[PDB]
Ligand SMILES: CC(=O)N[C@@H]1[C@@H](O[C@@H]2O[C@H](CO)[C@H](O)[C@H](O)[C@H]2O)[C@@H](O)[C@@H](CO)O[C@@H]1O
Ligand SMILES: CC(=O)N[C@@H]1[C@@H](O[C@@H]2O[C@H](CO)[C@H](O)[C@H](O)[C@H]2O)[C@@H](O)[C@@H](CO)O[C@@H]1O
């Protein structure tokens with residue numbers, strides 16, 4: 001199995017304050033489960049080849065998704081911003097598979113990704129433990 | 143908009159103890175969001191015609207999903223038990239739409255549903271506020 | 285160290301739904317901390333001879349406290365019901381020490397305790413692991 | 427009633443990640459309760475003249491407390507760092523009253539306070555709504 005444990009850092013009150021509004025797990029690799037402990041979020045997966053998505057909403061209405069997973073035994077991540085209300089995590093997570101429009105991002109196996117949204121919010125995912133089965137990453141909103 | 147607020151009642155320690163491992167929102171009706179407050183869980187939706195699923199896992203390994211939504215201006219619900227690890231909420235939620243195998247259950251517009259699983263766990267969903275836009279239901283594991 | 289992990293079972297929607305409104309840790313035995321994981325609550329203490337209290341409020345307005353700790357290397361518990369708003373856990377926890385009015389209950393070192401409040405709500409604390417340093421109990425509201 | 431709603435911002439992963447390990451409510455002004463909603467924390471009090479404390483622990487072992495309250499109809503705040511394990515929030519909260527050693531900080535009725543701990547962690551409490559009965563503050567760790 002693989003696990004990915006996320007710590008969420010929100011840096012800048014001017015961007016508003018984000019909370020989780022959805023959590024999905026893709027069905028490959030015998031699926032997986034999200035759990036929470038001590039304010040952290042862990043995705044546990046049945047092997048290499050699947051992923052999960054957290055969707056966040058800010059108190060200013062901004063919607064963004066963070067995807068993490070393991071592809072061919074290496075971690076990957078992506079952040080999608082500027083989402084419409086109908087673009088739920090249930091819509092987004094499958095887009096990384098079955099030759100969907102985001103598959104290329106999964107294939108990159110990124111240990112770090114940075115993107116800034118249409119309303120100016122800075123997002124970074126950065127793995128702090130980048131190899132092995134017990135992976136760790138910081139999700140930073142700025 | 144419609145909201146459905148759930149209170150989870152776990153009755154019987156012999157069944158183990160369940161926690162939420164996934165939360166999905168279907169993309170119809172401009173989507174929606176899950177939120178938590180005072181130990182309760184609220185699905186807020188952009189109109190009639192969509193839904194969301196909570197997947198639960200017990201500390202004895204049992205996996206079950208609870209689906210709630212609004213179909214043609216009336217609440218509906220379903221509970222699916224005996225799930226395999228690969229049958230995530232991401233798999234289950236869409237099965238209520240696009241002529242999927244669970245669409246019939248949504249169409250019933252049930253205000254109450256009772257089912258007992260293969261390992262003997264009793265599940266009930268019961269709406270306590272059954273009409274209007276601010277719906278309320280108890281989810282009982284027994 | 286000693287830890288006590290609690291699982292909260294709520295049986296009867298007629299009593300309303302309870303959530304935690306305060307958590308205290310008494311200062312003996314190098315204190316301790318509350319943490320949450322997978323819907324469970326763990327009090328971790330620096331040794332035998334201290335305790336902590338969760339105060340709960342129901343959505344029907346009922347206030348009650350659950351105390352757990354270790355006294356002379358054996359677990360103990362208590363439940364206090366019918367609290368007034370000013371009787372916070374900060375008031376209650378110290379009453380088990382310094383010859384306070386609740387010390388007698390700590391001294392009993394109970395592995396189980398049952399009480400019914402004046403409004404008819406049944407409360408039970410029952411330890412399912414009653415010996416050693418990694419203690420476990422169910423807290424049952426009914 | 428007075429309420430104080432807190433949003434917690436953590437800026438700098440180098441300081442580690444903090445989670446709440448205790449929440450107290452002082453017994454004056456008919457007490458009060460802590461609640462959580464959408465990742466925010468609200469202290470609801472029966473009137474002016476009381477307070478509550480959140481104690482946080484980082485995953486690097488640092489212990490700190492944040493006190494908020496209303497004194498003579500104006501908000502107040504304080505932060506105490508470098509705590510030993512036995513200095514729980516149960517010890518700290520009462521120190522703001524009965525001519526205790528921290529009363530002077532309550533009496534200042536501060537809308538903002540900044541402190542850096544001996545290990546280099548910056549803490550700020552800043553009220554964003556500083557008047558009326560529905561007060562709001564950001565708690566920033568850096
Ligand atoms: C080893 C690995 O990461 N493989 C990835 C695939 O994962 C496998 O997918 C199959 C279903 O096709 C099955 O669920 C396996 O258990 C799982 O390991 C899959 O994610 C593909 C997607 O393009 O990438 C890798 O091949
Ligand atoms: C009024 C209502 O509940 N209608 C249901 C449909 O919901 C609509 O679906 C469309 C997309 O087809 C769109 O998203 C609308 O905003 C939404 O109201 C849909 O759920 C169907 C599924 O069979 O049932 C009703 O017709």
Ligand SMILES: CC(=O)N[C@@H]1[C@@H](O[C@@H]2O[C@H](CO)[C@H](O)[C@H](O)[C@H]2O)[C@@H](O)[C@@H](CO)O[C@@H]1O
Pocket residue numbers: 311312313314331332333334354355356357381382
């Ligand atoms: C071993 C044990 O449980 N002792 C209990 C006491 O606990 C000790 O208390 C002292 C403070 O007086 C100190 O904090 C120690 O670290 C702690 O172990 C205490 O709880 C008394 C209360 O009457 O009961 C036992 O003796």
Ligand SMILES: CC(=O)N[C@@H]1[C@@H](O[C@@H]2O[C@H](CO)[C@H](O)[C@H](O)[C@H]2O)[C@@H](O)[C@@H](CO)O[C@@H]1O
Pocket residue numbers: 453454455456473474475476496497498499523524
């Ligand atoms: C109006 C106000 O904020 N008064 C503060 C006091 O609060 C009152 O305290 C008494 C108990 O002595 C009682 O609990 C009241 O209900 C409460 O309003 C108290 O906090 C003092 C502490 O020095 O400060 C103000 O006077």
